[PDB]
Amino acid sequence: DPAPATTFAHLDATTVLSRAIAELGIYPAVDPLDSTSRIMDPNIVGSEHYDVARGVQKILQDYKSLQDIIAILGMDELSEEDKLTVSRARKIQRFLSQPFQVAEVFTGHLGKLVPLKETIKGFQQILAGEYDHLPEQAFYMVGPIEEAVAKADKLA
Amino acid sequence: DPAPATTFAHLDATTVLSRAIAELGIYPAVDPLDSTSRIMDPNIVGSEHYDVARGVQKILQDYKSLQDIIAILGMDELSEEDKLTVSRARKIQRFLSQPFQVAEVFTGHLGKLVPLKETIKGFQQILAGEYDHLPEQAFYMVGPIEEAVAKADKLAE
Amino acid sequence: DPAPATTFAHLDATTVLSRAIAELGIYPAVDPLDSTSRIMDPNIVGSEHYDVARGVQKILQDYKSLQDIIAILGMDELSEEDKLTVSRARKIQRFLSQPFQVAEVFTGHLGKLVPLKETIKGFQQILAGEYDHLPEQAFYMVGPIEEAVAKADKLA
Amino acid sequence: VAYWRQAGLSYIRYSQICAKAVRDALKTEFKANAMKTSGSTIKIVKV
Amino acid sequence: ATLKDITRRLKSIKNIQKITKSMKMVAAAKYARAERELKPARVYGVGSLALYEKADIKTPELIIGVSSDRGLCGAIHSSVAKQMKSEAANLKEVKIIGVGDKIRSILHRTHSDQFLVTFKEVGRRPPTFGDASVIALELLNSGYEFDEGSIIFNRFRSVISYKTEEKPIFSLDTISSAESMSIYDDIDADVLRNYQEYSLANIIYYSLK
Amino acid sequence: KQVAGTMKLELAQYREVAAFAQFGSDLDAATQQLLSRGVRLTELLKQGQYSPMAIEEQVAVIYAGVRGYLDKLEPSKITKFENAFLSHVISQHQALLGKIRTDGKISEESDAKLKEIVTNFLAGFEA
Amino acid sequence: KQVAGTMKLELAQYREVAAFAQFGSDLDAATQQLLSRGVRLTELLKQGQYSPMAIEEQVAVIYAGVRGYLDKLEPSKITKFENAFLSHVISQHQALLGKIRTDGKISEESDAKLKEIVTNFLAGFEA
Amino acid sequence: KQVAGTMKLELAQYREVAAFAQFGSDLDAATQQLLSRGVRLTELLKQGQYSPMAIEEQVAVIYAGVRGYLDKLEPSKITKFENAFLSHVISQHQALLGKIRTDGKISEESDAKLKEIVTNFLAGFEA
Amino acid sequence: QMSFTFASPTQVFFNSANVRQVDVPTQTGAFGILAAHVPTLQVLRPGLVVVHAEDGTTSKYFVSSGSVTVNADSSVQLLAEEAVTLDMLDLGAAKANLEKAQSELLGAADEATRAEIQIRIEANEALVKAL
Ligand SMILES: *N(C(=O)NC1CCCCC1)C1CCCCC1
Secondary structure, rough: HHHHHEEEEOOOEEOOHHHHHHHHOOOOOOOOOOOOOOOOHHHHOOHHHHHHHHHHHHHHHHHHHHHHHHHHOOHHHHHOOOHHHHHHHHHHHHHHOOOOHHHHHHHOOOOOOOOHHHHHHHHHHHHHHOOOOOOOHHOOOOOHHHHHHHHHHHOO | OOOOOOHHOOOOOOEEEEEHHOOOOOOOEEEEOOOOOOOOEEEEEEEEHHHHHHHHHHHHHHHHHHOOOOOOHHOOOOOOHHHHHHHHHHHHHHOOOOOOOOHHHHHHHOOOOOOOOHHHHHHHHHHHOOOOOHHHHHOOOOHHHHHHHHHHHHHHH | OOOHHHHOOOOHHHHHOOOOHHHOOOOOOEEOOOEEEOOOOOHOOOHHHHHHHHHHHHHHHHHHHHHHHHHHHHHHHHOOOHHHHHHHHHHHHHOOOOOOOOOOOHHHOOOOOOOHHHHHHHHHHHOOOOOOOHHHOOOOOOOOOOOHOOOOOOOO | OOOOOOOOHHHHHHHHHHHHHHOOOOOOOOOOOOOOOOOOOOOOOOO | OHHHHHHHHHHHHHHHHHHHOOOOHHHHHHHHHHHHHHHHHHHHHHHOOOOOOOOOOOOOOOOOEOOOOOOOOOHHHHHHHHHHHHHHOOOOOOEEEEHHHHHHHOHHHOOOOOOOOOEEEEOOOOOOOHHHHHHHHHHHOOOOOOOOEEEEEEEEEOOEEEEEEEEEEOOOOOOOOOOHHHOOOOOOOOOOHHHHHHHHHHHHHHHOO | OOHHHHHHHHHHHHHHHHHHHOOOOOOHHHHHHHHHHHHHHOOOOOOOOOOOOOHHHHHHHHHHHHOOOOOOOOOOHHHHHHHHHHHHHHHHHHHHHHHHHHHOOOHHHHHHHHHHHHHHHHHHHHH | OOOOOOOHHHHHHHHHHHHHOOOOOOOOOOHHHHHHHHHHHHOOOOOOOOOOOOHHHHHHHHHHHHHHOOOOOOOOHHHHHHHHHHHHHHHHHHHHHHHHHHHHHOHHHHHHHHHHHHHHHHHHHHO | OOOOHHHHHHOOOOOOOOOOOOOOOOOOOOOHHHHHHHHHHHHHHOOOOOOOHHHHHHHHHHHHHHHHOOOOHHHHEEEEEEEEHHHHHHHHOOOHHHHHHHHHHHHHHHHHHHHHHHHHHHHHHOO | EEEEEOHHHHHHHHEEEEEEEEOOOOOOEEOOEEEEOEEEEEOOEEEEEEEEOOOOOOEEEOOOEEEEEEEEEEEEEEEEEEEOOHOOOHHHHHHHHHHHHHHHHHHOHHHHHHHHHHHHHHHHHHHHHOO
């Protein structure tokens, strides 16, 4: 739509909310592949931060490219390798989710604020496979990585 | 589009070019299922010319109708004959490509000119199965059917 | 589309005529589940009319649901309840047939004007199972329920 | 040792023969099931 | 979103749905028959296994994977293959057999130079003792004096669940000559030869069923 | 009218199953027969340009297929078969064609006459 | 032109066959080789920002791929290889780089020297 | 708030992908339990037209389902239960209903009292 | 009380049934397993199976081959590649069959071939017994 489309040119960072994401229960409903920043540069945020972001977006895009074949046949028909990108991707999609302090009044969950250093790390570990043994639901609506593992435990 | 759409009526032969085909490296990017000629008639070009042309169009429309299905359920569900057409269709699609003399600066290949009889022969043989053992790429960007055989040799080792 | 969308705001019911039903010889070729009416409500046509109607719809639905298990598997495998719902259903779908007067010049058969209370009751008896001892073709192309019982006596 | 052994035959192979014999000695009324069993679909792929 | 493309997609999905609904019904028929013939088979196969659990068998000091040729059955093949690679790794010499082309195409390349035989024509027509006897024969007629083997297959549980399992093949006529087997006397060293051969066909049949 | 209705019905039945043509291994006898009738009735509706047919000619070829005299013939040969067959009956059987006209239908006699031409001509055509 | 001449069409065909092969179909040696070649070249054309390369340097890295020397190197290693290969030739092979740039071509002599450099360097790299 | 909170949570858990029903004794343990409450609670939310309910009657029936008093009933019986339960409380426990209303809260007193009303009624209810 | 299990790949006759005794045809005679018999393993032979039920008038069966097992516990399991009740066997055929076999043998020199014929003879011959 001309209104929004003309607005992109005026921004330094863009956070695009998605209806399909919100319907999956993932809040904030930010589309991780359609949100950009003129600051996402290795010389500005550092190479570790830079590489972890490119990594997350890479696995999300690969999962996206698969979703078409999964829509009909499903996941059970994927190569033992694509099953793996799917798995980590889905865990990453949920780890991007997070309870807000300002929404406490209706969600009933304490809001969370995760420090940038804690954010990079958490995403590194998922990408490196350190949690392939943890269930997806453990990563949904938490703060830092430690809360994911803890939740994966309360799952007894 | 009204411009091109109102133009078909003033022609005797239409050569329709497609982006979907050019994008695949297939040049000239002619759409074999959307190009026509008022002289494509057995009484004018001979039933050999007519039948081969018509045979090429059929194996291609059949593959095209098949494509999206196998892209989902895979190839394994096709019969040995159903998939033998899939492989010849792809070969025929490749034998339609051609290194243009005028295009040397783009293909990096020596231009080629194929006599009518050689065209009919070549397409006829593939349709008949006389090349089911050569690899696809042998048919890509060549002139006469002999070069397909020779490229296949150059590809072996 | 705007045209049919605007028209629907005024319709109180629909009559859907189909080839599929015509090809089964049921005339009129009315689709028994596709055709509907806003006044198909107990508060309007009464509880007796409503209950009988709802019953026919369900049995026609249940019959359509068994089409799978019967096709690939075998009829000699449905449970006694199911086997019976197939006989009542088929009889039901035949009893919805009806010869018209207007077409007496082409059929040679007398048309029928079935009074509502007779209609409500006819099907009520089939659903009740009071005619499970008769052949389907007894309810095909007739008027009142009595005409079903008679057509049955025929010869044998 | 048995005659079939030493002759190269094994026991499964003996059982095979024995089981088939009992089949051929049935009567059409039970001969039907013979087909719904004793298949041979399996195919060797030795390389 | 082009009325052309949209139409192109609808075209191919309406066919998929049609071919896919068909394949479902065919399967449910094959399944129905298979579920039943499986009743006896278990009792029979569990019977064959009644000797070894009822009395120990280990081994001093052959991986058989079963599935089929046809895909489009969720993770039937990937499961056995997954567990098949796992063993070959954790392990003692390694030699393998795959019944059903799919296994020979999956847990393959990495382990071709680790093959003994492979089987085709599995799954279309219902399995038979006869097929099991061919598998057994083909093995006995092999130069692999296996000391111990395992058979990996999918154990049915319900239309919506199965579990990839393993069964030991102490077929080693040699191993069946251990202490625990002292309880059973009046056993010719070669009566076992027949006994083992037989119980080998029974176990392949069971997994197959 | 004598054959049209039947061809109409059989092609309609074919259309519902047509999607299994290249995906029907586990098919049953009936649905497999619908496929074969259809692919063939479909070939009999093909026609070259500038050669409109007399009504007796149209029905003779449609009758053949509808009564299954060509169910075993390979689909790709039907066009050539119809061509050759039509020349033969126009050449050697104007009597037959004449009656289908006059009687205004294919009688028991005409039917007998047709079956014998097509089963023997067909065998020679497949030689 | 000596290294990139037919690469555009070839990469187009590569992407086509790559999509089609995902259908598990059996692949002959010919298509497997095309896939191998395509995936490697795809990596060599990756490039970071703010560091435009001199033409003789692009020619040098293109060469290593188009001539087949990298067909057996794990694709995930191709970027690291290029970075090291390039610093190598720039550090110790200024004469070779300078001749390619000066003649604006790859002479038989320049060709013979590159082969010796890539095969040996590669072997070391894979140590 | 005291009863609809848990109903929301539970009804959600049920909604957490339950298109899978068809299996009964095939599912896990606690998951067949979610389809248990879920279908029951779903039946409680059904209502006819022209018969709006006082909030106090609403919590009474929702209390019944959210506390477990319907788990052992036959899905097709929850409406018969609800209707019978409600006329029983309207007629014999006006006071209790009065207090929940007037207070706008379910006191621990009113709870224990409500516990007894449903327990006894459920007991004498001939499904 | 012994739990007796008797079945073929296709059919099952007994499953953990408390039978008083069973008679089975083995390569070495015809062992009679009793509710309390010493552990043993044996391969079958074309013959007859006799199951003395808990209540007299025993039931008969015919077996082509397979195995039988008696464990430390009073559990027994008989497994025949094929096992049928005499009720479904045509004697007339068997005869016709034993004839042919003995004929082929007279025309075979190949040791292996002979073995395959010999075995067949044995089976068909064993068919006469309860028929
Ligand atoms: N060039 C072309 O037609 N001119 C030359 C080609 C070589 C032989 C003499 C004539 C084309 C002009 C349009 C763009 C592509 C090349």
